[PDB]
Ligand binder design. Structure first.
Ligand code: NA
Ligand code: NA
Ligand code: NA
Ligand code: NA
Ligand code: NA
Ligand code: NA
Ligand code: NA
Ligand code: NA
Lengths: 237, 248, 245, 240
């Protein structure tokens, strides 16, 4: 198993992409700290699924935009499993608005979680990370396609892309890898039909389309990649 | 003929450095310029006197682009003073470096509020007065290409600016308002290259990676701003022009 | 003040379209222009007449940039006629589309030889006369960003031009010679917009600025890059497609 | 096993990157046609190393249309199918602009570009839903080093070809992606000096090895990459 003995944290992992990454990491033998912001029951079902199949996992509630919660999520990993190897920053929220409608709260809520939350969780994690560790930031294909009415959301993801490249260089001497995945629209309307029509591989994405890439980046198979942004959108860029 | 004859521009963060040089260069091409400053009134007054002494029009206005009321007042100043608005240069920006271990909430908020939110607020207030042929220029940074260690917050702000540039290019395209970014390299005091000064270890390191063999000075950026502001760039929108002497 | 007063430029493939508009636009800023054509002598002669009748200096020279001797003669024409060389615009280029199944050796070679080897041979000849402040402008294409179906060879060639631009910027930077690319979108006959095909319609629908590009859209960016206004830009690739990328 | 029942072709596979890719893919259950331009011994060695699995050596120069076709026919004749193509066959030569010749241009573009197009063209007949094409390009398309105009040009062309074919073959659900390797140690003062200079610019603090590329090829060949096409993965230890 690619991640035997390793320990991963996945933020935003009660549902959807985060949930699928937590399970796929466990399938390769990582113990997984399943952080949830919203739905506790979803996270408990992720833990139950991991543990039923012979894995180890633990759910932990918390809001990554708050320094104390970010720290507690990292502590959980160490207090429960004694080590940390992989961080998946997946906690993200989204809201669209044209330039005329953008409010301060629209700006703050998204930057606080999508950017400051990545920084706080990563800062907390870095204390425990050494040679071979892998940090995976979940960004979005919007940094390539930058759609109308997405200035703040795409703004947050542009910030994540840049942070990924900074930390790759900064943490390189410590041999900690930092990469991004830039997913397309992932289904867990007009937009779905539009996006489908622009998607070369002829379907909409699913959570496990992202999960398999996160596992690759988490594993030693990606030991010579850092600072990369992998667009996982079925060909849309 | 002057490229910006009869036009009006706002330049945010224009008391010094790049923004000051941009204001002067836009005025040189006939634009009347609202010189916005965050706290150096004396700097902005100097830029206005240099503009008017050279035969141009300009007016200083103080205000924090991160505060909606100040964003609106900066834009009102253009319309009240000159009757119209054609060019917005979002240059207000602050910078601070820190490794991941030293990042704090205030370090994060201060840079994002000014370098991101201030761009959105100023642009939001301006667009109600922009029509076909208008040009918004966002001053980003070469850090979005080279992403140096200990710049996670700063570079993050500029990544955000780069993506906002793309979004608004698409969003404002049907109104025929252009939106582009300039991504400056490290910029040093005007006269540095003529004085033969390498000022610091950081300057030396960037200079060693700069193909053109010096560091940029403010007028290096200003001339690109005028280009993007003019009709010469009419078929460019959503671009990010790295202006670093070849460092990327 | 004319931005290129006293400078000398070469524009390859300048008998029509983008090339022609670039030649006229450089001369409008005071450059003397060597107007190179591959086939159409009459196109080049009318570009020259247009320039001289507007008070500038220009000369036509026929030649195939994919042949070393012709690339060298194009450059020697600048030096013999005007004494110097400051600006090279590598615009000569051909295109042909074809799906992978249909690609032929001739379809590959003709495009690579003109679009890539021609740029190399011309730049090579020019560099012998370029000094500080020189500017080399390669005409690439938006296809390097959008990479459309059935353009493997053509996009291949422009992808090569994009890379060569980055290499030569680093390579010639210590000599203070700038090297940049323009990556035009689809460009149609001048006047098509003001006047009012299915591919044209498709590309128009995908263009944020609401029309198709015309040659002067490219020309004015070429003048910028040729000038001292762009003195702090080298190795860049400017997409000039009305926002399509 | 990620590529159980699948068949792969890897071009220029007698040494270095290509050989390591061939062993990695067969390690996941794929039958590998191991193309070599010259070193039959190396290729045979690779095949021997493989035979847990299945493999067959084949000589050919992908720049020559008939050789490219025979590489693909070898796959179909020996194993009945074709699922993965790795276009690795590459020559490299460096020269500053003053030193560029017609022969230096042609030999690189013929193998690094026309050979990719010929081999791909032969192969696509046989490729269906879930097939994966992997083009080995180079980090040079990001870093564009001096004295590499022709070699970086070839790789810039491969990057663009990758994008075109991802969109072109999308409707058939054939994926097309590139790896952009950094310097992979696989001479004299020139090699040592270069190695130190690249090490110093490499954030992960060593030089690349062939397996560093191989493991990424196996990912792109596999279904784990089923939602990626038209991508270019830099595998350089962080140098870009
Ligand atoms: Na885009
Ligand atoms: Na695309
Ligand atoms: Na970079
Ligand atoms: Na570079
Ligand atoms: Na694309
Ligand atoms: Na786009
Ligand atoms: Na580069
Ligand atoms: Na880099």
């Amino acid at each position: 198993s690619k991640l035997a003995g390793k320990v991963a944290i996945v933020t935003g992992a009660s549902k959807g992409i985060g949930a699928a990454i937590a399970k796929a990491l466990a399938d390769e033998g990582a113990a997984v700290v399943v952080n949830y912001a919203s739905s506790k029951a979803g996270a408990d079902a992720v833990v139950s699924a991991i543990t039923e199949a012979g894995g180890r996992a633990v759910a932990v509630g918390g809001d990554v935009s708050k320094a104390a919660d970010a720290q507690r999520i990292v502590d959980t990993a160490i207090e429960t499993y004694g080590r940390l190897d992989v961080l998946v920053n997946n906690s993200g929220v989204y809201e669209f608005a044209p330039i005329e409608a953008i409010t301060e709260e629209h700006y703050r809520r998204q930057f606080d979680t999508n950017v400051f939350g990545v920084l706080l969780t990563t800062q907390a994690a870095v204390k425990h990370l050494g040679e071979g560790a892998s940090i995976i930031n979940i960004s979005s294909v919007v940094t390539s396609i930058t759609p109308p009415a997405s200035a703040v959301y795409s703004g947050t993801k542009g910030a994540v892309d840049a942070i990924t490249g900074v930390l790759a260089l900064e943490l390189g001497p410590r041999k900690i890898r930092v990469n991004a995945i830039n997913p397309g629209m992932i289904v867990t309307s007009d937009l779905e039909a539009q996006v489908l029509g622009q998607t070369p591989l002829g379907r909409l994405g699913e959570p496990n389309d992202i999960a398999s890439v996160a596992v690759f980046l988490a594993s030693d198979d990606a030991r010579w990649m850092t600072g990369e942004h992998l667009v996982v959108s079925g060909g849309l860029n």
